[PDB]
Write a protein that binds this ligand. Structure first.
Ligand SMILES: [Ca+2]
Ligand SMILES: [Ca+2]
Length: 210
DNA sequence: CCCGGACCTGTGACAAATTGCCCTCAGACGG
DNA sequence: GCCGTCTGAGGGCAATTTGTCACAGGTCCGG
């Protein structure tokens, strides 16, 4: 199945995207890399890759596409829009999109890589961000270890405001997304908390391959 | 000494958002 | 040149997940 690769600058960028949008974004990076910024999406192909009906694919593409407008991307800083023209459909079952050409060098650069079958069952978009950030540190054999700062997680994944209260951070983000990765990917993941005084400051992740 | 305050934790509620499903009906084409 | 079928563009749903905050109970310090 298709092998996604992307510059680390994208793995660690600040942005907020939905799941359907992140799915499309993988195909855009794939199209661009296989060579102006103009990409294309087929309803029937999206449906087959991610196991949807054609109808639900259509719904997913259309709403994802109108939710890109006004969205911006920050590289740590410098801000860019994803799209510089609205999407449009020349043919039935076919969409044309215009990615910001200044983003191309940030897509292709110190890199992260994974096969698309690894992530296509994840549902929570914050868990997709987390799985991308672990892959950036993976060894050939399939293991790794990394320390991510809690303040940096909040900024980069643009977590919502009540998750700055740590018991809520634990309950609705950390525990749920570590559970998804262990249930929906071939990865097996564990963690431990680093503290300073009363405050918890980092999360230390270790993982191996099944 | 206590006591109140500034911190920290987990849980029960409720509100808003997202999920996979289901149904209708016209577009595009082949045979 | 018409119709039978495969698509996909629309309109919705209830059941779950995700986002928010009130309240109870831990600690340590300065007064
Ligand atoms: Ca969201
Ligand atoms: Ca959907």
């Amino acid at each position: 199945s298709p092998r996604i690769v992307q510059s680390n600058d994208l793995t660690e960028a600040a942005y907020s995207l939905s799941r359907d949008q992140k799915r499309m974004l993988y195909l855009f990076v794939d199209q661009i890399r296989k060579s102006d910024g103009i990409c294309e999406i087929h309803v029937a192909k999206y449906a087959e890759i991610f196991g949807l009906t054609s109808a639900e694919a259509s719904k997913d593409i259309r709403q994802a596409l109108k939710s890109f407008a006004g969205k911006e991307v920050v590289f740590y800083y410098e801000s860019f829009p994803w799209f510089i023209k609205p999407a449009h459909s020349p043919s039935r079952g076919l969409y044309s999109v215009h990615i910001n050409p200044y983003l191309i060098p940030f897509f292709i650069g110190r890199f992260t890589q994974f096969r698309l079958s690894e992530t296509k069952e994840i549902t929570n978009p914050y868990a997709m961000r987390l799985y991308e950030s672990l892959c950036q540190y993976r060894k050939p054999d399939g293991s790794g270890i990394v320390s991510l700062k809690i303040d940096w997680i909040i900024e980069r994944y643009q977590l919502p405001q009540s998750y700055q209260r740590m018991p809520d951070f634990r309950r609705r983000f950390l525990q749920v997304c570590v559970n998804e990765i262990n249930s929906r990917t071939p990865m097996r993941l564990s963690y431990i908390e680093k503290k300073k005084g009363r405050q918890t400051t980092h999360i230390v992740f270790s993982f191996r391959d099944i």
